Design an enzyme around this catalytic site. Structure first.
Site, PDB file in Angstrom:
ATOM      1  CG  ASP A  36      40.066  38.851  61.893  1.00 22.77           C
ATOM      2  OD1 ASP A  36      40.881  39.903  62.491  1.00 22.77           O
ATOM      3  OD2 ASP A  36      39.140  38.187  62.646  1.00 22.77           O
ATOM      4  CG  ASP A 232      41.396  43.260  64.662  1.00 21.12           C
ATOM      5  OD1 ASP A 232      41.643  42.443  63.683  1.00 21.12           O
ATOM      6  OD2 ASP A 232      40.434  43.533  64.994  1.00 21.12           O
TER       7      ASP A 232
END
Length: 389
Positions: A36, A232
């Site tokens: 992430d 992201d």
């Protein structure tokens, strides 16, 4: 470069996330960790849970250190909380090094672990500024760079299949590569184009122009980065500020009007199904995001196909239909270049030179007529002005 051992070290898919294998503690406890770039905490399930096949057992690790401090992380729909400590960490299919890193042992969570996702923790690869409880909790990558000579950068090739994968298929398939400390040339085609990391907190960038099938959305560029624009891998969709979203969807609908879809499709709530192999990719437009270049007054663009923004979802029904969800949605926290966007490109997080590179991914989904692309340069003026404050 060529870091063959790290090629194909990821598994997963856009809707549930891509993860890498890691070990924590002594003796090593193997766990699947979500990659992430939108967060900065290394956190792992540390207690039994319905959606966890395994979890971190601190009492079984001889090298576990208790920092006697709790951490709470809330988000839109759910959250997790746990206890801070440190332990020895390794990445089996990463560089051959062992580091002592902060680890948030998740004690309680709500809507964090997803049924069938298969990951048991999260690896926040962003910067300290956004780490919880505060920026004094050093992120994993920072500990890695400080403690070893691994170059300060990593690159990601997330590979979407372009169709639904069942539980068996995800487990038995390669979802991509996370090259830690370098770039592997087999993962992309064409050239790498870099855009500056505006500020080191999220991996923030600046978008200066948006096109739908070559037609300029023509909004004041600050709207495109309204709040911020970030890359992201921990978010599925391409998320756009409300105003941009409404303009983009109006244009996409116009380009695809030969077919009409329910409102729920455009809201990214319901799927659209076409008979086996007949998805009409050609009616959907390509989308180009122009990014600020490294050279003054220069920009470049990355172009994605509907094969990237239409996310495959299985038709739990008994049909042989090909079904998808519209993977572009509105945001109130700025632009988010999520997984469906990253699936189109090899993305280089060059922390060392404060820039992010983009190249056409060797594994992006496309058809015989169109391919994703990264092209430049384009003469563009007053781009700094596209940034929000």
């Amino acid at each position: 470069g060529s870091f063959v051992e790290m090629v194909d070290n990821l598994r997963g898919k856009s809707g549930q996330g891509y993860y890498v294998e890691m070990t924590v503690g002594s003796p090593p406890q193997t766990l699947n960790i979500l990659v992430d770039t939108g967060s900065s905490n290394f956190a792992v399930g540390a207690a039994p849970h319905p959606f966890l096949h395994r979890y971190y057992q601190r009492q079984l690790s001889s090298t576990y250190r208790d920092l006697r401090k709790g951490v709470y992380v809330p988000y839109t729909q759910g959250k997790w909380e746990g206890e801070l400590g440190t332990d020895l960490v390794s990445i089996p299919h990463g560089p051959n090094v062992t580091v002592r890193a902060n680890i948030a042992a998740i004690t309680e969570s709500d809507k964090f672990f997803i049924n069938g996702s298969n990951w048991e923790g999260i690896l926040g690869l962003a910067y300290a500024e956004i780490a919880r409880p505060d920026d004094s909790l050093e992120p994993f990558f920072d500990s890695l760079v400080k403690q070893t000579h691994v170059p300060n950068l990593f690159s990601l090739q997330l590979c979407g299949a372009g169709f639904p994968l069942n539980q068996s298929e995800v487990l038995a398939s390669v979802g991509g590569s996370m090259i830690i400390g370098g770039i592997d040339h087999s993962l992309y085609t064409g050239s790498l184009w870099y855009t500056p990391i505006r500020r080191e907190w999220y991996y923030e960038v600046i978008i200066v122009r948006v096109e739908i099938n070559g037609q300029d959305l023509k909004m004041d560029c600050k709207e495109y980065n309204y709040d911020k624009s970030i890359v992201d891998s921990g978010t599925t969709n391409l998320r756009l500020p409300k105003k941009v979203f409404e303009a983009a969807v109006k244009s996409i609908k116009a380009a695809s009007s030969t077919e009409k879809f329910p409102d729920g499709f455009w809201l990214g709530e319901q799927l659209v199904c076409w008979q086996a192999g007949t998805t009409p990719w050609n009616i959907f437009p390509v989308i180009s995001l122009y990014l600020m270049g490294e050279v003054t007054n220069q920009s470049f663009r990355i172009t994605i196909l509907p094969q990237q923004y239409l996310r495959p979802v299985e038709d739990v029904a008994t049909s042989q239909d090909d079904c998808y969800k519209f993977a572009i949605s509105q945001s109130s926290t700025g632009t988010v270049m999520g997984a469906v966007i990253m699936e189109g490109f090899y993305v280089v997080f060059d922390r060392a030179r404060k820039r992010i590179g983009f190249a056409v991914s060797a594994c992006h989904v496309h058809d015989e007529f169109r391919t994703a692309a990264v092209e430049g340069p384009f003469v563009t003026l007053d781009m700094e002005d596209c940034g929000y404050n």
